Design a protein around this ligand. Structure first.
Ligand SMILES: COc1cc(-c2cncc(-c3ccc(C4CCN(C)CC4)cc3)c2C)cc(OC)c1OC
Ligand SMILES: COc1cc(-c2cncc(-c3ccc(C4CCN(C)CC4)cc3)c2C)cc(OC)c1OC
Ligand SMILES: COc1cc(-c2cncc(-c3ccc(C4CCN(C)CC4)cc3)c2C)cc(OC)c1OC
Length: 286
């Protein structure tokens, strides 16, 4: 009745971590990305697969799902997640060697806010509400059209042993006051992380011939691979937030972005902006 071509050619490894590996692959001419999970991180494959079996997300700013594959081997199980392939790589990668103008900076951050609001908001008929729980510049891909998409739903929570990246954890995560039975708590953790990403991008926007070098959030106050305690002392005890450079206050776009990131960083989670309010504010800038 029909051939089911499942052969995927793995062409090039574009990522190797504790999570496993990501490969550029080829299926029937078409480029795909293949994430091969470490045994260490099998539950991330299970959770992303469980979510996509619940709701087939389709959004321009969400990394496009193609397939979840489990294959029996000699004495192990092999777990692959297959997605769209974005050749320009992660936003983290992209910001290292690219500077931005006003239009590209706004297009990047509004596309992220768009993907995040899509995750957050319940649609009746639709989709459950979803919080990401590990938003960061390495989990955002740059598309050829200048918009981004959000990747990695391995920690996602839905409403109707992995933890987040410590550098991006909100204060209520670090001080363990987060209300774990409350879905809105998880949206507010994502908004904190979004504000840090907005800071990382805004630094690379040129104004009056000036730009900042790429740095990760809190680069000046914590070590590489900061401990939970290192982060708690900065974010909770001292209540530090990323520096806004003086040069931003000469530029109307960066002045508006600095205000937006402040309103993502309130100690009180319920004071933080919503993803929908961030979108509206971004559409009114420039
Ligand atoms: C099993 O595994 C993999 C399968 C595929 C794949 C390859 N050719 C054809 C298909 C196909 C899709 C959909 C239908 C429809 C036909 C109409 N009917 C009303 C319902 C069913 C049939 C066939 C698939 C799904 C690709 C893979 O990788 C990209 C796979 O591995 C992950
Ligand atoms: C998983 O991913 C990819 C899959 C395919 C693909 C291969 N064979 C058959 C199909 C197909 C045909 C028909 C139906 C429907 C149509 C009508 N409906 C009312 C019931 C049945 C569904 C599916 C697809 C979609 C191609 C892809 O790319 C070109 C894929 O992406 C990499
Ligand atoms: C964040 O996480 C996931 C990411 C991806 C993914 C999707 N498109 C493209 C990529 C990629 C391609 C190329 C480069 C480099 C190599 C070539 N050049 C020298 C510089 C650029 C980097 C990255 C990735 C890593 C897929 C995933 O799942 C299958 C991910 O996990 C959910």
């Amino acid at each position: 009745q029909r051939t089911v071509a499942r052969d995927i050619t793995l062409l090039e490894c574009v990522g190797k971590g504790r999570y496993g590996e990501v490969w550029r692959g080829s299926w029937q001419g078409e480029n795909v990305a293949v994430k091969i999970f470490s045994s260490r991180d099998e539950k991330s494959w299970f959770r992303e697969t469980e979510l996509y079996n619940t709701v087939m997300l389709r959004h321009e700013n969400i990394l496009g799902f193609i397939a979840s594959d489990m294959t029996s081997r000699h004495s192990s199980t092999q777990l692959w997640l297959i997605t769209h392939y974005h050749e320009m790589g992660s936003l983290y990668d992209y910001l290292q060697l690219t500077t931005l103008d006003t239009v590209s900076c706004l297009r990047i951050v509004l596309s992220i806010a768009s993907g995040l609001a899509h995750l957050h908001i319940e649609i009746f008929g639709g989709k459950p509400a979803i919080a990401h729980r590990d938003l960061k510049s390495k989990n955002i891909l740059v598309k050829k059209n200048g918009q981004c998409c959000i990747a990695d739903l391995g920690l996602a929570v839905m409403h109707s042993p992995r933890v987040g990246t410590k550098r991006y954890m909100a204060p209520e995560v670090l001080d363990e006051t987060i209300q774990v039975d409350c879905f809105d708590s998880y949206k507010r953790v994502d908004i904190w992380a979004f504000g840090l990403v907005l800071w990382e991008v805004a630094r690379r926007m040129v104004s009056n011939g000036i730009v900042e070098d790429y740095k990760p959030p809190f680069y000046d106050v914590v070590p590489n691979d900061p401990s939970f305690e290192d982060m708690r002392k900065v974010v909770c005890v001292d209540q530090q937030r990323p520096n806004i450079p003086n040069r931003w206050f000469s530029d109307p776009t960066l002045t508006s972005l600095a205000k937006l990131m402040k309103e993502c960083w309130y100690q009180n989670p319920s004071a933080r902006l919503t993803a929908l309010r961030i979108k509206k504010t971004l559409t009114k800038i420039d």
